[PDB]
Amino acid sequence: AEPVVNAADAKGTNVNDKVTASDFKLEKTAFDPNQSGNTFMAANFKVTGQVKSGDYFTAKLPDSVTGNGDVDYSNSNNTMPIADIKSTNGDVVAKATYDILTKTYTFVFTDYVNDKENINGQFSLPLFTDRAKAPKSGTYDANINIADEMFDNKITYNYSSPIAGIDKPNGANISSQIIGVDTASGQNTYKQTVFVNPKQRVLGNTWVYIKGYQDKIEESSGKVSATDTKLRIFEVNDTSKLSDSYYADPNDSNLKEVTGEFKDKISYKYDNVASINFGDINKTYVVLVEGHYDNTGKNLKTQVIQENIDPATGKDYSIFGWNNENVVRYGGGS
Ligand SMILES: [Mg+2]
Ligand SMILES: [Mg+2]
Ligand SMILES: [Mg+2]
Ligand SMILES: [Mg+2]
Ligand SMILES: [Mg+2]
């Protein structure tokens, strides 16, 4: 019924003891995740002695990073296929997979390895922030491990500040980030975080539009509707505790869900756009969007917008918009 386990894979025997990594290098130590910024890690590796088909070795990510970034594999067993290690002749030497939960790569050997000895090679992998564990702009410990060898590192995330808007006390202010996109399962879903009035200004007759396209509706795979979209809305207690990474957890104590108070305040009157009547609001809110994209293949392009006037004077009308873009593209399914 219950047995002890040490890993998340099926195969022969782990051979970290036979694999030594070397010349470990990050393409860079600083980038803006909020601008589709990322890095790659790359290393040489060698097998001392012999291994066989089904033996494997591993690499582990720290809290600061993910192997998958904004690509979601919930609908694929939280498992993200990786490109294979191939030989000059073209033959696959190892099959690669990344467990999202465990932030662990696994490389399994193919029958290639049987009749050979003292394999050497190198590989690179993309690396992205962990929006959840690296929520704020700053410098994190990024010590990566390979074949049981720790390669100490440090990454700096300069997240474009999600606190953006019209520079005036009455100013319209808003922003968003799509931090989650399922491109494998075929369900075509995404997660977008929207920060409303992150200046925590007092704004009247405030309207917010979440568009599933930007300029030209034809140019986006975005599908915003009653049927395609689910919205959750939270008042923010202390806007100071909002993440630069747009990661927001519904169960956060800093959030107070209010989506209920919005029952008849959300409209889909317009094609591919969700209109939200906030009205007079004097604080910051988070909208968690769970959305869908179409099979067109077009980039998922989005745009969030907020407008308002002075609640006391009804003058000083202000409008502010924020754009979002992601690649949903995939190859062949059947
Ligand atoms: Mg080793
Ligand atoms: Mg999909
Ligand atoms: Mg209003
Ligand atoms: Mg509509
Ligand atoms: Mg205004």
Residue numbers in the entry: 201 to 534
Task: Reproduce passages from the article.
ClfB, an MSCRAMM (Microbial Surface Components Recognizing Adhesive Matrix Molecules) family surface protein, described as a fibrinogen-binding clumping factor, is a key determinant of S. aureus nasal colonization, but the molecular basis for ClfB-ligand recognition remains unknown. ClfB plays a key role in establishing human nasal colonization by binding to the human type I cytokeratin 10 (CK10) expressed on squamous epithelial cells. In this study, we solved the crystal structures of apo-ClfB and its complexes with fibrinogen α (Fg α) and cytokeratin 10 (CK10) peptides.
No electron density was observed for the C-terminal eight residues in the apo-ClfB structure. The polypeptide chain of apo-ClfB(197–534) is composed of two distinct domains N2 and N3, as previously described for other MSCRAMMs in S. aureus. The N-terminal N2-domain contains 146 residues (amino acids 213–358) and the N3 domain 170 residues (amino acids 359–528). In the crystal structure, both N2 and N3 have two layers of β-sheets that pack tightly against each other. In contrast, packing between the two domains is much looser, resulting in the formation of a large groove between them where presumably ligands bind. Additional hydrogen bonds involving ClfBGln235 and ClfBVal200 further contribute to the N-terminus-mediated interaction between ClfBs. Structural comparison of the apo-ClfB and the two complexes shows that the RMSDs of the Cα atoms in ClfB are 0.46 Å and 0.49 Å respectively, indicating that the overall ClfB remains unchanged upon binding of the ligands.
